[PDB]
Structure formats: C-alpha cells, structure tokens
Amino acid sequence: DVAGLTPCSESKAYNKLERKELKTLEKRLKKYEPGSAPYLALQATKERTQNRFKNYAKAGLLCGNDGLPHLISDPGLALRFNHAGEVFIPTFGFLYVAGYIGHVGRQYIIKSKEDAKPTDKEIILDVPLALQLAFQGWAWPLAAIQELRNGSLLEKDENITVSPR
Amino acid sequence: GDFLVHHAIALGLHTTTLILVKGALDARGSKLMPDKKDFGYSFPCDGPGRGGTCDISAYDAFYLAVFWMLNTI
Amino acid sequence: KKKEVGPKRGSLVKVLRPESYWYNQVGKVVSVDQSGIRYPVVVRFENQNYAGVSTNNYALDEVTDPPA
Amino acid sequence: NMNGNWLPGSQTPAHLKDLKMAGNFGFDPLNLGAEPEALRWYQQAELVHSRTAMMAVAGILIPGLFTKLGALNVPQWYEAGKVYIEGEGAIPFGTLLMSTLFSYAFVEGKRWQDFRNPGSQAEPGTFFGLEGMFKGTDNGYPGGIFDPLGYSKTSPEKLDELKLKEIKNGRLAMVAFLGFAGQYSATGKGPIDNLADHLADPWHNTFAENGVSVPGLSAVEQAAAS
Amino acid sequence: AGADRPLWSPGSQPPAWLDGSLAGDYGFDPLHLSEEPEMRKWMVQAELVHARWAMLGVAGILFTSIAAKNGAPFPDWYDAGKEAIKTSPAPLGSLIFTELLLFGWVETKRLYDLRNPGSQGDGSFLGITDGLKGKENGYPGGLFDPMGMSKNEASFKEAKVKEIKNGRLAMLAFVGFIAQHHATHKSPIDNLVDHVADPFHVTFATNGVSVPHFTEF
Amino acid sequence: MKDFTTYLSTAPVVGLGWAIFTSGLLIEINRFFPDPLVFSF
Ligand code: CLA
Ligand code: CLA
Ligand code: CLA
Ligand SMILES: CC(/C=C/C=C(C)/C=C/[C@@]12O[C@]1(C)C[C@@H](O)CC2(C)C)=C\C=C\C=C(C)\C=C\C=C(C)\C=C\[C@@]12O[C@]1(C)C[C@@H](O)CC2(C)C
Ligand SMILES: CC(/C=C/C=C(C)/C=C/[C@@]12O[C@]1(C)C[C@@H](O)CC2(C)C)=C\C=C\C=C(C)\C=C\C=C(C)\C=C\[C@@]12O[C@]1(C)C[C@@H](O)CC2(C)C
Ligand SMILES: CCCCCCCCCCCCO[C@H]1O[C@H](CO)[C@@H](O[C@H]2O[C@H](CO)[C@@H](O)[C@H](O)[C@H]2O)[C@H](O)[C@H]1O
Numbered sequence: 053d054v055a056g057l058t059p060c061s062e063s064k065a066y067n068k069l070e071r072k073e074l075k076t077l078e079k080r081l082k083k084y085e086p087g088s089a090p091y092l093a094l095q096a097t098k099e100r101t102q103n104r105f106k107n108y109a110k111a112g113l114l115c116g117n118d119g120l121p122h123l124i125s126d127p128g129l130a131l132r133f134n135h136a137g138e139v140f141i142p143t144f145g146f147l148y149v150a151g152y153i154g155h156v157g158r159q160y161i162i163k164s165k166e167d168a169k170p171t172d173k174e175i176i177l178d179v180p181l182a183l184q185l186a187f188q189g190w191a192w193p194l195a196a197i198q199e200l201r202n203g204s205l206l207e208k209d210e211n212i213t214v215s216p217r
Numbered sequence: 218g219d220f221l222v223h224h225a226i227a228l229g230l231h232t233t234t235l236i237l238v239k240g241a242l243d244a245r246g247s248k249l250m251p252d253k254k255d256f257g258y259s260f261p262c263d264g265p266g267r268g269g270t271c272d273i274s275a276y277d278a279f280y281l282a283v284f285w286m287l288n289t290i
Numbered sequence: 291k292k293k294e295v296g297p298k299r300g301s302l303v304k305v306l307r308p309e310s311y312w313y314n315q316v317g318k319v320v321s322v323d324q325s326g327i328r329y330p331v332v333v334r335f336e337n338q339n340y341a342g343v344s345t346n347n348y349a350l351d352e353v354t355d356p357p358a
Numbered sequence: 359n360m361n362g363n364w365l366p367g368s369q370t371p372a373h374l375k376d377l378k379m380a381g382n383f384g385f386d387p388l389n390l391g392a393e394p395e396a397l398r399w400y401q402q403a404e405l406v407h408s409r410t411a412m413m414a415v416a417g418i419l420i421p422g423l424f425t426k427l428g429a430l431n432v433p434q435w436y437e438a439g440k441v442y443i444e445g446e447g448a449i450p451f452g453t454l455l456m457s458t459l460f461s462y463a464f465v466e467g468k469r470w471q472d473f474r475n476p477g478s479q480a481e482p483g484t485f486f487g488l489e490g491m492f493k494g495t496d497n498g499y500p501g502g503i504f505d506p507l508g509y510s511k512t513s514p515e516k517l518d519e520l521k522l523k524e525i526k527n528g529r530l531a532m533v534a535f536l537g538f539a540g541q542y543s544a545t546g547k548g549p550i551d552n553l554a555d556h557l558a559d560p561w562h563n564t565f566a567e568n569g570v571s572v573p574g575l576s577a578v579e580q581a582a583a584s
Numbered sequence: 585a586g587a588d589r590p591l592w593s594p595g596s597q598p599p600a601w602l603d604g605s606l607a608g609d610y611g612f613d614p615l616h617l618s619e620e621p622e623m624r625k626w627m628v629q630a631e632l633v634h635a636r637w638a639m640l641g642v643a644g645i646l647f648t649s650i651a652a653k654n655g656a657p658f659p660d661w662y663d664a665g666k667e668a669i670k671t672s673p674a675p676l677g678s679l680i681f682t683e684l685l686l687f688g689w690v691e692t693k694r695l696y697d698l699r700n701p702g703s704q705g706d707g708s709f710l711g712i713t714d715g716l717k718g719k720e721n722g723y724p725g726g727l728f729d730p731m732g733m734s735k736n737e738a739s740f741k742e743a744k745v746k747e748i749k750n751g752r753l754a755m756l757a758f759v760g761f762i763a764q765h766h767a768t769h770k771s772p773i774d775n776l777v778d779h780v781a782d783p784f785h786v787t788f789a790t791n792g793v794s795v796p797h798f799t800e801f
Numbered sequence: 802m803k804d805f806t807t808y809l810s811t812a813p814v815v816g817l818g819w820a821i822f823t824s825g826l827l828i829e830i831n832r833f834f835p836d837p838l839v840f841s842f
Contacts, residue, residue, distance in 0.1 A: 104836040111841045137840035177815050191388045216246040216308045251309040267340035367696030367703035566677040575677040582676045619802035
C-alpha cells in the first residue's frame with residue numbers, strides 16, 4: 053500500500069483491463085470455427101493473457117488508479133515490502149552480465165595488444181581465444197577488484213595521451 | 218510518466234551540459250587542434266586536412282547546444 | 291663527436307611535446323641527425339595521427355626513456 | 359607436487375603446478391589464484407567457508423538423523439529458527455542477530471588483522487595477557503587455544519594429511535549444504551526424508567522427476583506418456 | 585594404402601591431406617574438410633563414434649524388427665520409446681539425465697584422450713595405467729579390446745577398413761530406415777519382404793511419397 | 802579451409818553469429834517463459 057498504490061490482486065482497474073482484453077480476444081475468437089489454426093492461435097493468446105494477468109498478481113505488484121502495475125524503486129523500501137526483485141535484483145543481474153562483457157573485452161584487448169599488428173587481431177577475431185575468455189569470465193568481479201588492488205586495472209596518467217591545455 | 222519525463226529532462230540537461238563543457242574546456246586547445254586559442258572563438262574550420270575539422274570551435278559547440286537546449290525546453 | 295648526440299637507435303622513447311599528437315606516447319628511434327638540426331630525433335609510432343603519418347622529428351629535450 | 363588432477367588430460371595452471379598446497383587439485387580454470395597474496399586470501403576464504411559448511415551440515419544432519427531414528431525431537435533446519443522464535447522463553451530475533459553478529463565482528467576483525475599482518479595479534483599487553491598464544495602458525499591455521507589438544511603438533515606429513523582431510527571434508531560439506539538448500543527449495547522436505555525417498559524409490563524420486571529442478575521435463579514426460 | 589588406391593571416383597585427384605593412411609580413405613572431400621591435422625583427427629573421431637553408434641542402432645532396429653516379424657511382441661523402431669517408457673520402471677526425465685550422467689564420464693575421457701593422447705592411462709581412474717591408453721587416434725584398445733587380434737598391424741588395418749566400411753553402410757541404413765519409414769509407415773523388414781515379394785511393382789515409386797502424384801494420368 | 806576459417810574469424814561473421822545466438826536465446830526464453838516482468842521464481 054506504499055506510494056498510495058493498491059496491490060494488483062485487490063485492485064479494481066486491473067480487473068477492468070483484464071476483462072477488456074479477454075473481451076476483445078473473445079470477440080476476435082468468435083469469428084473463426086473452433087477446429088481452425090487461427091482459433092488455436094487466439095486461444096493460446098487468451099491463455100497467455102490470463103496467465104500473465106495471474107502471474108502479475110500474487111507477486112507483490114502494485115498499481116495506481118489505472119490497473120497498470122508500478123515498480124517500487126528505492127531499495128530498503130523494496131526490501132521491506134517484498135519488491136526487491138522488481139528493480140533491485142534485475143540491476144544486480146544486469147551489472148553481473150555487463151561486467152562479464154566488459155571484463156571479457158578488456159581481457160581480449162590486453163591479450164591481443166601483445167602480438168605484432170594488434171589491429172589485425174582486432175578486425176579478424178581469434179575465435180578460440182574469444183571463446184576461452186568467454187568461458188573464463190564467470191568470476192569477473194573478483195578478478196576486476198584484484199587488478200584494482202594490484203594496480204594493473206588503472207594506467208598512470210604519465211603514460212596516457214593528454215590533450216593540450 | 219512524470220518520472221520518465223523528468224528523467225528525460227535530466228538527460229537533456231546533462232547532454233546540453235556535456236556539449237557546452239566540451240566546447241568550453243577544449244576551447245583553447247585539443248588533440249585535433251592544439252592552437253585553438255590562436256584562432257579565436259568563432260572560426261569555421263581548419264580545412265579537410267587531418268581527416269576533417271569542421272565545427273571544431275567552441276562557437277560551433279554552442280550552436281549545437283542551442284539545438285539541444287531547444288529540445289530540452 | 292664523442293658517443294652520440296641523441297639516444298640509442300631503435301630504443302623506445304617517450305614524447306614530451308605537448309602539441310604533438312603522440313604526447314605521453316612511446317615510439318621507436320629510427321635515426322638521430324648528427325649535423326646539429328633543431329629536431330634530429332626521428333621517432334616512428336605504431337599508431338598514426340589524423341593526417342595518417344607515423345614518423346616525426348623531435349628535439350633532444352622532448353624525448354625521454356619510457357617509464358615502467 | 360600435487361595431490362591429484364581434477365581433470366585428467368587437462369593443462370594444469372602454472373601457479374598450481376609446482377605449488378606445495380594442502381588439498382590442491384589444479385581446479386582453477388578461471389585463474390583466480392594467479393597472485394600469491396590473492397591465493398592466500400582465497401585459501402583463507404575457502405577455509406572459513408569450509409568450516410561454515412561442516413558446522414552447518416553437522417548441525418543439520420546429526421540432529422536430523424537422531425530425529426529420524428526417534429531419539430531426539432528437534433525440528434528440521436528450515437523451521438527450527440521459526441519455532442525457536444516462537445518459544446515461551448525466546449530471546450527476540452533482532453537481539454540474537456545483532457549480538458552474535460557483533461561477536462562475529464570481533465573474531466573476524468581479529469582474523470582480518472592477523473591476515474593483513476601475520477603474527478600481529480601477539481602484541482604484548484593487549485588481550486588480558488593471553489595474547490601471546492594468538493600468534494598464527496600458517497595462513498588460516500592460528501593454533502594455540504584453537505588447537506588445545508595439540509593434534510597439530512606432529513610430523514609435517516601428518517599435518518599435511520590432516521589439512522588434506524579437513525579441506526576434503528570441507529568441500530564435501532559445501533556441496534552438501536548447497537544440495538540441502540537446493541533440494542529443500544525443490545522438494546520441500548528434509549534431507550533425511552530426501553535420502554529415504556531416494557533409497558526407497560531411486561527412479562521415481564530424483565531431481566529430474568520434478569519440474570522445479572529442470573523446467574519443461576514434466577511436459578516432455580506427459581507428452582511421452584500421452 | 586595410398587598412391588594407386590581406388591578412389592571415390594575413377595580419375596579423381598586425391599587431396600593432399602588424404603594420403604590413404606586412414607581407414608576408408610577414398611579421397612572424397614569436395615568441401616575440403618579435415619584439412620588441418622587437428623580437424624582431421626577430430627573428424628576421424630567423430631566419424632568413428634557416429635559409425636559405432638550407427639551400427640549399434642541399426643543392429644538393434646534390425647533385431648527387433650526381425651523378432652517382431654517372426655512373432656515376438658516387439659513394436660516398430662519408430663515410436664518404440666512411448667511403449668518403452670510405458671513399460672519401463674524408470675520414468676522419463678530421470679532416464680535421460682541418468683544416461684547423461686553415465687555418459688559424461690566416457691565422453692570426457694574420450695575428449696581428453698583425443699586432445700591429449702595417452703593421458704587417460706595414468707592411474708587416475710582406479711589405478712589403470714596400461715589400459716585406457718589410446719593405441720591410435722580413435723582406436724583406444726586396452727580394456728575395450730579384451731581379445732588381442734589387433735596386435736598384428738595387418739589385422740588391425742583390415743579390421744579398421746572393415747569397421748569404417750560397415751559403419752558408413754550403417755549410416756546409409758539409418759538414413760534409409762528414416763526415409764522409407766516416413767514413406768511407408770512400416771517396419772524395415774516389412775519393406776524388405778515387400779520388395780522381395782513383388783520386386784517389379786513394390787518399390788519407392790508406389791508408396792505415394794517420394795515421387796509425387798498430381799494429375800494421376 | 803583455414804582461409805575459410807579466417808573468413809569466419811572476421812568481425813562481421815562473428816558479430817552475426819553472436820547476434821543469432823543472443824537473439825535465439827532471448828526469443829526461446831521469452832517463448833518458454835511467456836511475458837516475464839517480475840522476478841519471481
Ligand atoms: C532489458 C534490460 C536492459 C538493457 C537492454 C540495458 C541496456 C543498456 N544498459 Mg542498462 N540497466 C538495466 C537494464 C537494461 N539495460 C537495469 C535493470 C539496470 C539496473 C537498475 C541497469 C543499469 C545500467 C547501468 C548502471 C549502466 C547501464 C548501461 C547500459 C548500456 C550499455 C551497456 C554496455 O556498455 O555493455 C555492457 C557493459 C560493458 C561493455 C562495460 C561494463 C560497464 C558496466 C556498466 C560496469 C559494471 C560494473 C560496475 C563496476 C558496477 C557499478 C556501476 C556504476 C554505474 C555504479 C545499454 C544501452 C551503461 C550505459 O548506458 O553506459 C553509458 C551503464 O553504465 N545499465
Ligand atoms: C568491451 C570493450 C569496452 C570496454 C571495457 C569499454 C569501457 C568503457 N567505455 Mg567504451 N565503447 C566500446 C567498448 C568498450 N568500452 C565500443 C566498442 C564502443 C563503440 C560503440 C564504445 C563507445 C564508448 C562511448 C561513446 C563511451 C564509452 C564509455 C566507456 C566507459 C563507461 C562504461 C560503459 O559501459 O560505457 C558504455 C559503453 C558502451 C555503450 C559501448 C558498448 C559497445 C558494444 C555494445 C560493446 C562491445 C563489446 C565488445 C565487442 C566485446 C569484445 C569481446 C571480445 C572477446 C570479442 C568505460 C571506460 C563512456 C565513457 O567515456 O565513460 C567514462 C562513453 O562516453 N565507450
Ligand atoms: C532498455 C529498456 C528496456 C528494458 C528495461 C526492458 C525490459 C523488459 N522488456 Mg522490453 N523492450 C525494449 C527495451 C527494454 N525492455 C525495446 C527497445 C523494445 C522494442 C524492441 C522492447 C520490446 C519488448 C516486448 C515486445 C516485450 C518486452 C519485454 C520485456 C521484459 C523481458 C524480460 C525477459 O525476457 O525475461 C528475463 C530474461 C532474462 C533474464 C534473460 C536471461 C539472460 C541471463 C544472462 C541468463 C542467460 C541464459 C543462460 C542461463 C546462460 C548460460 C548458458 C549460456 C552459456 C549458453 C522486461 C520487463 C517482454 C515482457 O514480458 O514485458 C513485460 C515483452 O513482451 N519488451
Ligand atoms: C557457511 C555456510 C552455511 C552456513 C549456514 C548456516 C549457519 C545456517 C543456519 C541454519 O542451518 C542452521 C545451521 C540450523 C537451522 O536450524 C537454522 C539455520 C538458520 C537454517 C555455507 C558455505 C557454503 C559455501 C559454498 C557452497 C562454496 C562454494 C564454492 C564453489 C562452488 C566454488 C567454485 C569455484 O571457485 C572454484 C573452486 C574455482 C573456480 O575456478 C570456479 C568456481 C566455480 C568459481
Ligand atoms: C548419414 C550420416 C552422414 C552423412 C554425411 C555425409 C553424406 C557427408 C558428406 C561430405 O562430408 C563429405 C563426405 C565430404 C565433404 O567434402 C562434403 C560433405 C557433403 C560434407 C550419418 C548418419 C549417422 C547415423 C547414426 C549415428 C545413427 C544412430 C542410430 C541410433 C543411435 C539408433 C537409436 C534408436 O533410437 C532409435 C533412433 C529408434 C529406436 O527405435 C531404436 C534405437 C536403437 C533406440
Ligand atoms: C533458451 C533457454 C530457455 C529455457 C530452457 C529451455 C526450456 C525449458 C522449459 C521452459 C518452460 C518450462 O515450463 C515451466 O514454466 C512455464 C512458464 O509459463 C509454466 O507453465 C505452466 O504454467 C503456465 C501458467 O503459468 C501454463 O500456461 C502452462 O501451460 C503450464 O505448463 C510452468 O512453470 C512450467 O511448465
């Protein structure tokens with residue numbers, strides 16, 4: 053009941069939206085014979101709509117004055133009101149995947165800059181090396197913070213090209 | 218929707234600020250144009266040399282940021 | 291002249307010229323002029339500039355050993 | 359040398375090939391233990407997580423086995439905290455949580471201080487005159503009152519054998535506790551009940567028979583049975 | 585075993601990487617696969633395991649179909665899995681994952697013997713050193729060869745040639761099984777007795793499939 | 802073959818392969834888990 057938002061299970065406009073979608077799906081369904089492929093496709097669409105409307109309920113979702121679900125944003129408020137999985141956990145998973153991609157790219161750049169003509173390796177990928185680094189990045193945050201600790205993650209400003217003042 | 222449009226406003230402010238401070242900080246020099254202080258504030262370009270140098274002055278950065286400010290407002 | 295005017299040929303050098311494209315960058319010494327010109331140290335770089343060139347002439351005071 | 363190979367025919371990492379380490383099997387495909395100090399921190403973390411694992415697994419299994427036999431009447435691990443909170447002389451959950459968390463803060467601050475500087479807890483006149491026995495022997499093996507029976511005061515080969523046994527039962531306890539959590543989340547019953555179900559009906563009771571562990575397997579079973 | 589050997593087509597030029605040393609080397613590679621030696625040994629291992637499973641499956645299918653024709657209550661090779669899991673004490677799901685569990689060990693050992701030859705026979709698996717050592721690339725021997733007729737080089741070579749030829753014939757047999765079961769919806773032995781009953785009429789052109797009929801005139 | 806393998810080792814081919822793999826993974830996830838919005842089991 054936070055932010056003046058009713059839960060989707062106890063909401064009123066949520067049910068109106070569900071009935072409206074089921075009504076237009078049934079209106080589209082009534083134009084076809086029961087033993088037809090469009091009938092089966094529309095029945096599958098109606099079943100998916102009902103399952104989505106049921107699964108959006110009984111999960112702590114809140115909607116305000118329109119039946120459209122709202123996402124609780126602040127952690128702590130989301131943690132104490134069963135809304136952590138709305139945005140708190142998805143950004144944790146996204147940060148994991150984004151750090152995976154960044155660490156794999158960093159490892160490929162560092163390992164490809166060692167050999168002669170690194171631009172050829174950049175534009176013609178070493179597929180076994182890329183796949184080896186792809187399956188070795190499952191522990192990207194530990195490795196990243198350890199390179200931060202030993203200083204190999206950062207480059208000294210004396211060795212970095214600097215625009216004139 | 219109010220939160221989404223406020224975040225879009227924040228995007229507009231941040232991008233216009235980015236253009237304006239890129240123009241201001243690189244006004245007197247840059248990697249492409251180290252001697253930008255000797256060419257004044259409002260000069261067209263340096264020609265097609267070094268890959269192309271159009272809209273390199275801080276005045277042109279301001280003139281792009283006018284578009285971005287118009288979009289933000 | 292005793293020894294040489296500039297650094298060892300083929301050795302890595304770091305460019306201290308601020309207006310140069312390769313400021314704080316490492317290049318290889320191709321040749322050092324012994325005549326006494328203003329910029330005798332010829333440095334070749336792996337990464338080309340916006341003009342597409344990769345070699346330049348620098349004086350003695352704008353080249354140092356690369357830090358490690 | 360090395361105790362054994364986790365994957366025969368695979369290239370052993372260089373940092374683990376010549377390493378004289380207790381319980382080493384070259385299982386670093388991600389090369390996390392490349393640095394020696396990072397290897398020391400990972401070794402200490404493995405030791406603490408292992409001791410965690412065996413303490414929790416023993417507390418889950420032995421009272422659970424006693425209750426299965428009928429000698430004890432304690433509940434299973436997934437509701438014991440719930441019933442203990444609802445006791446008639448029950449300390450509140452927050453009080454116990456913060457008190458034993460503060461006690462952990464004390465021991466773990468001591469552990470961090472003796473890791474970042476070995477033997478630094480033996481500073482004289484610090485802990486009631488008992489600080490002279492707080493000096494650690496090796497990485498993750500403090501000794502002293504942590505080993506009052508003196509079982510580690512033996513031959514070095516016996517010490518390495520004991521360390522290998524400790525880390526092997528520790529890793530077995532990690533996978534055991536992970537299995538406890540996973541198959542309680544899947545089946546919804548105790549670990550002894552799951553063992554009894556696997557013993558009575560091995561084919562019908564497994565991880566693959568339920569759609570929680572592997573989604574979509576029940577649909578394939580229904581399609582095959584149709 | 586090379587040079588003037590019978591090729592896949594007379595007058596063809598054999599590839600440089602196909603010198604006839606391998607079993608069944610007829611110089612047949614339009615797509616230039618197995619050019620690299622590592623990819624060549626990968627292809628040899630893949631062909632060998634596909635061949636062995638092809639002859640195993642084809643022999644099982646033929647045995648079941650022959651017994652079904654003779655009178656044993658055996659279903660067709662197609663849709664046999666349904667009645668199999670109907671009568672199996674082991675349900676599906678557990679069965680496939682059980683097969684994967686006792687298959688992963690053998691597949692891991694095969695893969696790391698292919699990548700590292702002789703590395704399996706080091707006593708790591710229950711103290712087995714002389715056994716589990718690959719005599720050739722895709723030919724382990726040892727515990728998989730209890731009777732030692734592969735000690736002679738000539739016998740080993742002719743056995744390799746016979747194995748790869750029967751394996752390729754088994755690939756063709758499995759493809760034929762799938763094709764004429766999709767065309768006739770009958771057992772392969774049923775197709776065989778139909779072909780030997782009326783050879784001049786019962787063929788691939790009279791099943792209503794394969795050759796389409798549009799005008800019927 | 803190795804010339805063809807280096808051709809597939811070029812950036813657009815591996816980019817197409819990655820795009821196909823990621824699109825197929827996301828599409829099969831969305832098909833077998835219809836309309837995911839709330840992280841619950
Ligand atoms: C459908 C889901 C979805 C999609 C498609 C995107 C798409 C995108 N996100 Mg977003 N994001 C999402 C959900 C999603 N996001 C959610 C749910 C959260 C949590 C609330 C975030 C939080 C987030 C952040 C914080 C950032 C992005 C960024 C990006 C963009 C580039 C990512 C990148 O560079 O490649 C993958 C990543 C790399 C190649 C380099 C790794 C860099 C990552 C961000 C660092 C991760 C480790 C870091 C130390 C953790 C702290 C982060 C720091 C901001 C505090 C891209 C347009 C980035 C962006 O736009 O930058 C301009 C960015 O900084 N996203
Ligand atoms: C994997 C390589 C890699 C890494 C580690 C970084 C890291 C960074 N970039 Mg860069 N970037 C990259 C590739 C990379 N970038 C590419 C390919 C482009 C061209 C599109 C850019 C364009 C770019 C801009 C324009 C900006 C950054 C910025 C940043 C910083 C913010 C973090 C972030 O996610 O930005 C967001 C990054 C992106 C949205 C770029 C994503 C591009 C693709 C989708 C990722 C490529 C992954 C690569 C193919 C993986 C190779 C693996 C290998 C095995 C094949 C950070 C230092 C920002 C900055 O300066 O912050 C301080 C900034 O303004 N980057
Ligand atoms: C950047 C903004 C943004 C954000 C945050 C989202 C987020 C979302 N949208 Mg939207 N969308 C966007 C942009 C965005 N989209 C755009 C630009 C378009 C137009 C092209 C759409 C069009 C669109 C449609 C039409 C639909 C969505 C849907 C969704 C949901 C997808 C969730 C999902 O697939 O399950 C979660 C999926 C995952 C977590 C993927 C798993 C990946 C991890 C890494 C695991 C990897 C798999 C595997 C285990 C890895 C190991 C194996 C591997 C080695 C092979 C989510 C709420 C769908 C929905 O349900 O809406 C609510 C839907 O119907 N969106
Ligand atoms: C401490 C611990 C658990 C402690 C649990 C406790 C106290 C729970 C409390 C209770 O239950 C009791 C006791 C009794 C109940 O009445 C009450 C409750 C409240 C329910 C687990 C550690 C558990 C630790 C685990 C499982 C660690 C696993 C680590 C793995 C798998 C690492 C693998 C790898 O790192 C390698 C080795 C090499 C890399 O290259 C690759 C990867 C894969 C990264
Ligand atoms: C046909 C085949 C492979 C054909 C490959 C060809 C033509 C390749 C040609 C080329 O490469 C060359 C030469 C050279 C290149 O330059 C060009 C190309 C063109 C690329 C493999 C079959 C391979 C066939 C195999 C492995 C068959 C396995 C069968 C099994 C396991 C059976 C199991 C059963 O389950 C069933 C199905 C049903 C149950 O009733 C019974 C049981 C027994 C349970
Ligand atoms: C690319 C990787 C994709 C994921 C791995 C491969 C696919 C594995 C199977 C995925 C689907 C398994 O199905 C599992 O989730 C479905 C998601 O709607 C749910 O499906 C079940 O409930 C739905 C309503 O909620 C009904 O419409 C379905 O008819 C019913 O089967 C069940 O929880 C379970 O059947």
